[PDB]
Amino acid sequence: PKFKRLPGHIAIIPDGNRRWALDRGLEKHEGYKHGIVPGLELYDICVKIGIGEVTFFGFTQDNTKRPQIQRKAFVDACIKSVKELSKHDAELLVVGNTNSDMFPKELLAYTKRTKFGKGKVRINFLVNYGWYWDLTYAFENIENIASAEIPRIDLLIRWGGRRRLSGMLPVQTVYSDIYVVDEMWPDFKPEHLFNALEFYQDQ
Amino acid sequence: PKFKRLPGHIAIIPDGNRRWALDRGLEKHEGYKHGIVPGLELYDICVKIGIGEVTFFGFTQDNTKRPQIQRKAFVDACIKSVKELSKHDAELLVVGNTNSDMFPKELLAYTKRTKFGKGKVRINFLVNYGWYWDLTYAFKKMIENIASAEIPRIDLLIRWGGRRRLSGMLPVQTVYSDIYVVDEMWPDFKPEHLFNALEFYQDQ
């Protein structure tokens, strides 16, 4: 799959895990564990076609107020995802509010950017993230927002059909092209990514 | 057209003016004036359906780096838009960087929210707006003191001309806005574009 122009940095909102699960007659929370392989496959594809940088929207400060069994499933999915990717030649950064009981302690090793393997691509995760916490971070210590190490996003791709930004990195998405996949994130398909890329290269 | 629900606050990016002009065989800068009447049409529909507040994306600091001839034209069209809306039942606020040779003097008067006729709808226009200028204005709860502070949260952003982007529109107020893209260029505005956006917003 050959492309006139590619984005330097792709933002991913991996939504639709709960609907995917109910839709299969599973419990809401059971969908998140099916989100991990989609993420590794997107990572593989990005390495092969040469996407420099990928940011995943993990979970916000508000998402922690969801039922416990959901929160634990989606937290556990983000941890598995970072551990797995660290096994596979990723430069990893986790941005989120570490000053919170809801920051998962297993990811404190990744709050400063860490080369793993040949460091093929920069992968960022928003984990216990909040746009308001991100922006106000600067008064307390705009080059200085929480998410300052995450650069401008060229293309944001959202699964699960909703057409909102959900407070993902307000500063870095000011001029980003947005593509919405209707399918749920666990139903990820290479062509979803390629269709976003076809769309991007035309802009 | 019966609605169970409406957005409180609609945001309009009236894009496509140049491509529409080129497509008619005009110069690029001649599209913007074909953008004025559509705006006054959108407002009349908002007033008649009960939309409370509409914010128009006029132009940004970035947009002024374009050639003299385009800048003059989209500034004139914005000035004419605001003057025309002043004749309606609208509470008008212009927001943007007034410490600039690029802010038109004729819109300074509108930088305080001003009720005309019966003030049936709040219209905000962004004129010499920049997202960086907006966030840094707070110079801690300083997000409540950004330049666009008088412009509340956006429920629905509707962009004409097929592009799915914010072009730096109100990063704070758009954090969770629903987004509807209309492929047709802004001067090809039809009531069906607004109705389709609101049906999408409600059926959500």
Side-chain angles (χ1 to χ4, degrees), chain A, chain B residues 1-124 126-204:
Chain A
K2 282 169 106 207
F3 289 107
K4 252 181 167 276
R5 209 202 39 192
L6 287 169
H9 183 193
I10 293 169
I12 299 311
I13 309 180
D15 262 27
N17 300 281
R18 287 182 301 177
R19 276 162 299 158
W20 183 86
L22 290 189
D23 193 294
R24 245 110 170 146
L26 278 33
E27 295 297 298
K28 284 168 174 173
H29 75 275
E30 281 177 293
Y32 294 104
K33 58 197 152 74
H34 292 90
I36 288 138
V37 155
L40 301 171
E41 285 176 6
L42 183 140
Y43 166 95
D44 256 284
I45 293 151
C46 273
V47 171
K48 288 145 194 183
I49 89 193
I51 305 311
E53 179 150 14
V54 166
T55 297
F56 288 102
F57 208 161
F59 78 85
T60 65
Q61 297 198 104
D62 276 23
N63 299 148
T64 76
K65 259 68 76 201
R66 295 275 180 76
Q68 183 271 152
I69 192 184
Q70 285 171 47
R71 173 176 68 261
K72 190 245 209 159
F74 73 55
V75 170
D76 287 359
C78 296
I79 300 162
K80 303 181 256 266
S81 284
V82 171
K83 262 86 166 98
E84 249 305 275
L85 288 172
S86 74
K87 315 232 75 205
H88 282 110
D89 302 303
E91 215 172 325
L92 288 161
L93 180 73
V94 172
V95 173
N97 183 11
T98 66
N99 191 203
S100 159
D101 291 307
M102 292 290 126
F103 196 88
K105 54 185 182 188
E106 308 82 334
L107 299 182
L108 285 170
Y110 309 99
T111 64
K112 186 174 214 263
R113 184 172 272 116
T114 314
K115 194 181 165 143
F116 299 81
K118 298 194 188 74
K120 294 183 193 293
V121 30
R122 295 199 160 181
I123 308 308
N124 315 301
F125 284 77
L126 313 186
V127 159
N128 191 46
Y129 173 89
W131 72 262
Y132 182 101
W133 164 85
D134 190 11
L135 294 198
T136 55
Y137 194 84
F139 203 88
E140 315 162 340
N141 46 248
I142 287 303
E143 296 200 45
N144 298 295
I145 56 159
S147 77
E149 293 309 308
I150 299 182
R152 168 149 315 166
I153 294 150
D154 298 306
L155 174 65
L156 184 140
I157 317 170
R158 175 157 189 160
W159 277 258
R162 288 172 302 211
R163 330 227 213 102
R164 320 195 261 273
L165 294 186
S166 305
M168 188 170 187
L169 294 173
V171 160
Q172 290 100 320
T173 55
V174 280
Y175 310 126
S176 313
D177 294 286
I178 303 139
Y179 184 93
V180 179
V181 172
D182 296 292
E183 244 142 295
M184 305 305 130
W185 172 250
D187 281 322
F188 170 84
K189 270 146 66 230
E191 69 176 314
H192 292 139
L193 177 66
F194 299 143
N195 299 333
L197 289 173
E198 258 128 88
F199 153 80
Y200 178 72
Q201 87 169 353
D202 304 334
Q203 321 304 291
Chain B
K2 267 307 147 59
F3 289 113
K4 297 152 50 232
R5 202 184 164 217
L6 287 178
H9 182 200
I10 284 188
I12 303 309
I13 303 177
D15 201 37
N17 298 293
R18 294 187 297 165
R19 279 174 280 162
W20 180 96
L22 288 181
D23 168 69
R24 303 321 190 76
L26 300 166
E27 307 304 310
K28 281 185 219 98
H29 71 276
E30 300 190 79
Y32 295 116
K33 74 177 101 96
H34 292 90
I36 294 144
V37 160
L40 299 170
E41 220 164 292
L42 186 142
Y43 157 102
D44 289 338
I45 302 155
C46 286
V47 164
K48 290 160 199 45
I49 66 178
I51 303 291
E53 182 150 4
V54 181
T55 303
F56 287 103
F57 207 13
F59 68 93
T60 63
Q61 310 221 75
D62 260 349
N63 292 159
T64 52
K65 288 131 62 108
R66 273 170 203 169
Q68 184 140 109
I69 207 169
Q70 281 152 70
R71 184 215 316 144
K72 254 171 62 231
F74 70 54
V75 172
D76 292 347
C78 288
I79 291 169
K80 204 157 182 289
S81 299
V82 171
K83 279 170 180 179
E84 283 289 346
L85 278 170
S86 81
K87 294 183 244 169
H88 304 261
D89 301 321
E91 304 206 339
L92 273 41
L93 177 66
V94 176
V95 163
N97 177 5
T98 68
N99 314 307
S100 181
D101 46 281
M102 289 295 139
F103 191 104
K105 308 323 218 254
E106 303 95 319
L107 291 184
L108 285 175
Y110 302 96
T111 58
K112 162 117 79 66
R113 190 167 268 118
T114 311
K115 175 183 201 298
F116 303 92
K118 295 151 142 192
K120 285 184 209 295
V121 49
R122 325 256 273 196
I123 316 299
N124 316 305
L126 307 177
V127 176
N128 207 39
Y129 176 83
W131 68 263
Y132 185 86
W133 166 80
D134 188 14
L135 297 200
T136 63
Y137 196 89
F139 50 77
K140 98 115 5 136
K141 105 194 42 258
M142 80 202 144
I143 263 66
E144 297 84 292
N145 297 94
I146 57 163
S148 60
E150 295 283 328
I151 300 170
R153 188 165 279 173
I154 300 166
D155 296 306
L156 180 64
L157 189 152
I158 317 165
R159 178 167 183 141
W160 278 260
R163 295 210 264 275
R164 177 110 63 191
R165 45 173 88 135
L166 306 174
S167 304
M169 198 183 192
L170 293 178
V172 173
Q173 296 96 332
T174 55
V175 281
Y176 318 117
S177 320
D178 295 308
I179 304 175
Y180 194 86
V181 180
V182 176
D183 300 331
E184 268 158 311
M185 309 301 131
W186 168 248
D188 289 335
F189 171 83
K190 290 174 260 306
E192 72 161 309
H193 301 155
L194 179 59
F195 295 138
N196 289 340
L198 296 181
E199 254 157 85
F200 156 82
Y201 182 73
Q202 160 185 275
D203 290 316
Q204 203 73 196

